[PDB]
Design an enzyme around this catalytic site. Sequence first.
Site, PDB file in Angstrom:
ATOM      1  N   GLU A  42      -5.874   6.698  -1.817  1.00  0.00           N
ATOM      2  CA  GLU A  42      -5.904   5.636  -0.814  1.00  0.00           C
ATOM      3  C   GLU A  42      -6.414   4.318  -1.387  1.00  0.00           C
ATOM      4  OE1 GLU A  42      -5.314   4.847   2.529  1.00  0.00           O
ATOM      5  OE2 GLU A  42      -3.807   6.375   2.070  1.00  0.00           O
ATOM      6  N   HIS A  92       0.837  -1.196   0.000  1.00  0.00           N
ATOM      7  CA  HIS A  92       0.000   0.000   0.000  1.00  0.00           C
ATOM      8  C   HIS A  92       0.876   1.251   0.000  1.00  0.00           C
ATOM      9  CE1 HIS A  92      -3.446   2.560   1.618  1.00  0.00           C
ATOM     10  NE2 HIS A  92      -2.382   3.262   1.984  1.00  0.00           N
ATOM     11  N   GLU A  93       1.855   1.299   0.908  1.00  0.00           N
ATOM     12  CA  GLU A  93       2.656   2.508   1.055  1.00  0.00           C
ATOM     13  C   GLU A  93       3.587   2.701  -0.127  1.00  0.00           C
ATOM     14  OE1 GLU A  93       2.309   4.960   3.167  1.00  0.00           O
ATOM     15  OE2 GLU A  93       0.690   3.903   4.153  1.00  0.00           O
ATOM     16  N   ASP A 147     -10.172  13.882   8.457  1.00  0.00           N
ATOM     17  CA  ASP A 147      -9.469  12.876   7.657  1.00  0.00           C
ATOM     18  C   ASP A 147      -9.151  13.413   6.261  1.00  0.00           C
ATOM     19  OD1 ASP A 147      -8.290  10.310   7.412  1.00  0.00           O
ATOM     20  OD2 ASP A 147     -10.101   9.538   6.438  1.00  0.00           O
ATOM     21  N   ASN A 163      -1.474 -15.523   2.728  1.00  0.00           N
ATOM     22  CA  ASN A 163      -2.759 -15.530   3.417  1.00  0.00           C
ATOM     23  C   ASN A 163      -3.662 -14.440   2.836  1.00  0.00           C
ATOM     24  OD1 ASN A 163      -0.472 -16.006   5.777  1.00  0.00           O
ATOM     25  ND2 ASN A 163      -2.072 -17.548   5.690  1.00  0.00           N
ATOM     26  N   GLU A 201      -4.846  -6.762   8.258  1.00  0.00           N
ATOM     27  CA  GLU A 201      -5.266  -7.798   9.201  1.00  0.00           C
ATOM     28  C   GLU A 201      -4.096  -8.478   9.899  1.00  0.00           C
ATOM     29  OE1 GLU A 201      -5.628  -7.889   5.890  1.00  0.00           O
ATOM     30  OE2 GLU A 201      -4.228  -9.541   5.395  1.00  0.00           O
ATOM     31  N   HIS A 224      -9.579   8.186   4.040  1.00  0.00           N
ATOM     32  CA  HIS A 224      -9.630   6.782   4.437  1.00  0.00           C
ATOM     33  C   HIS A 224     -11.052   6.256   4.586  1.00  0.00           C
ATOM     34  CE1 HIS A 224      -5.435   7.681   5.722  1.00  0.00           C
ATOM     35  NE2 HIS A 224      -5.265   6.529   5.105  1.00  0.00           N
ATOM     36  N   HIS A 238       1.835   4.377  -2.969  1.00  0.00           N
ATOM     37  CA  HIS A 238       1.751   5.840  -2.931  1.00  0.00           C
ATOM     38  C   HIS A 238       2.907   6.465  -3.716  1.00  0.00           C
ATOM     39  CE1 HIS A 238      -1.685   6.546  -0.392  1.00  0.00           C
ATOM     40  NE2 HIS A 238      -1.176   5.900   0.643  1.00  0.00           N
ATOM     41  N   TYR A 264      -3.757  14.562  -1.938  1.00  0.00           N
ATOM     42  CA  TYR A 264      -4.170  13.819  -0.748  1.00  0.00           C
ATOM     43  C   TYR A 264      -5.293  14.525   0.019  1.00  0.00           C
ATOM     44  CZ  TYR A 264       0.171  11.006  -1.301  1.00  0.00           C
ATOM     45  OH  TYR A 264       1.150  10.151  -1.744  1.00  0.00           O
TER      46      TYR A 264
HETATM   47 CA    CA Z   1      -6.437  -8.352  14.929  1.00  0.00          CA
HETATM   48 CA    CA Z   2      -4.949  -8.071   3.468  1.00  0.00          CA
HETATM   49 ZN    ZN Z   3      -7.216   8.653   7.629  1.00  0.00          ZN
HETATM   50 ZN    ZN Z   4      -4.138 -11.411   4.489  1.00  0.00          ZN
HETATM   51 ZN    ZN Z   5     -13.134   3.073   8.284  1.00  0.00          ZN
HETATM   52 ZN    ZN Z   6      -2.298   5.276   2.190  1.00  0.00          ZN
HETATM   53 ZN    ZN Z   7       0.207   5.909   4.349  1.00  0.00          ZN
END
Ligand code: CA
Ligand code: CA
Ligand code: ZN
Ligand code: ZN
Ligand code: ZN
Ligand code: ZN
Ligand code: ZN
EC number: 3.4.24.27
Length: 316
Positions: free
Chosen positions: A166, A142-143, A226, A183, A190, A231, A146, A157
Site C-alpha cells: 500500500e 496508486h492503483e 484490514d 495540485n 483529496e 491501510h 499495484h 496483500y
Molecule cells: Ca473532501
Molecule cells: Ca494527493
Molecule cells: Zn483497508
Molecule cells: Zn493533490
Molecule cells: Zn487511516
Molecule cells: Zn492500494
Molecule cells: Zn486498491
Amino acid sequence: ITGTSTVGVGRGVLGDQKNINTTYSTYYYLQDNTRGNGIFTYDAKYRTTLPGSLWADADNQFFASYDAPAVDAHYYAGVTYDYYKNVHNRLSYDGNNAAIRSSVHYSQGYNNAFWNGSQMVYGDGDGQTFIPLSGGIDVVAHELTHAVTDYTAGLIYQNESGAINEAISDIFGTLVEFYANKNPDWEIGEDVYTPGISGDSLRSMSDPAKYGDPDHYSKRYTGTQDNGGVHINSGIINKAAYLISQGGTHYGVSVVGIGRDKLGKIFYRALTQYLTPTSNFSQLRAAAVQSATDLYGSTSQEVASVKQAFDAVGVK
Ligand SMILES: [Ca+2]
Ligand SMILES: [Ca+2]
Ligand SMILES: [Zn+2]
Ligand SMILES: [Zn+2]
Ligand SMILES: [Zn+2]
Ligand SMILES: [Zn+2]
Ligand SMILES: [Zn+2]
Ligand SMILES: [Ca+2]
Ligand SMILES: [Cl-]
Ligand SMILES: [Cl-]
Ligand SMILES: [Cl-]
Ligand SMILES: [Cl-]
Ligand SMILES: [Zn+2]
Ligand SMILES: [Zn+2]
C-alpha cells in the site's frame, strides 16, 4: 480498433479541460495509439460486466457529465505511463508495453476503484463519500502501481508486506501527482473524497496521525482487521518516505531531506531489485539502504538520510 489517430478535447471530473488521444473510425474512440500497445477506455454502463464497450463518441468532444470519468481515466493512465517511461525507463506496468485498459461507470454508487489483475475499474462514487474515482490522479497512479508491484516483487496483500504494498502505491501515486503538477500534496485521494468537505483526504503521508494512523512502529496496529492493517500501518512507511524527501524532525530524530526525484529512484530500485513477496518493514529498510548505496555510494548523504528516516519511525 483500426483508425486514424486524433486528438479530442474534454472536461474531467473536476471541471478542467484537457486534450485526449483518440482514434477515428466513423466514431471517435478512447483509444490512445501513442503509448505502448495502447491505452483503451471502456464504458461499463453501470453493470458489473467487464470491460464493457470501448468508449465511442460522435464528435470528439467530451463535455457531457457522463463523459467526465472516462476523460480522466484515459488521460491519467497516459500520465502514469509517461511517468514510468520517462523517469524510470519502464514500459507500462509489466515493463513490456502492455496495453492499459480502464472501465468507468462500474456498478452504481460504487465507492471504490481497483486494479483487478488485467485492467483498471472505477466506480462513480455515491456523490457524498466520493465523486468518480478516476478524478484523482493519485488514485489512478496508486492503483496502477499495484500492477507494477505484482509484476516485480509480488508483495502479498496482508500484514507488513501488505502495508508496504500500500505504501509503495501511495509513494508513487504522490510522485505522479507531483510529476503532472496537478495540485500536488502529500495527501491521498483529496481530489475525489468528500466533495462537501474541504481540506481532508483518505490519509496523510506528511502527518499520518492527523487521521489516527500510526507514524511509528511502536504504534503499529497488530489486529486482524484490514488484512492485518494494510491501510493503517502504511502510515509508518509513508512518513519515512515523506521524511526522506522533505526532511524534518520526528520523535526527536532529525532527517536531512534529499528531494522527490531521489526518493523515487531509491524506492523504485528497492521494489524492482530487492523486495520479495514476504518482505517486512525491516527488510524494506535494508533494501532501501542498499538501493541508495548502489546509486549514490555507501558514504553518501542519501544513504544517511534513508537510515535517519527509518530510525525516526522506529524501523530497524
Ligand atoms: Ca473532501
Ligand atoms: Ca494527493
Ligand atoms: Zn483497508
Ligand atoms: Zn493533490
Ligand atoms: Zn487511516
Ligand atoms: Zn492500494
Ligand atoms: Zn486498491
Ligand atoms: Ca461528444
Ligand atoms: Cl509533521
Ligand atoms: Cl508527526
Ligand atoms: Cl516533519
Ligand atoms: Cl514528531
Ligand atoms: Zn513527527
Ligand atoms: Zn513531521
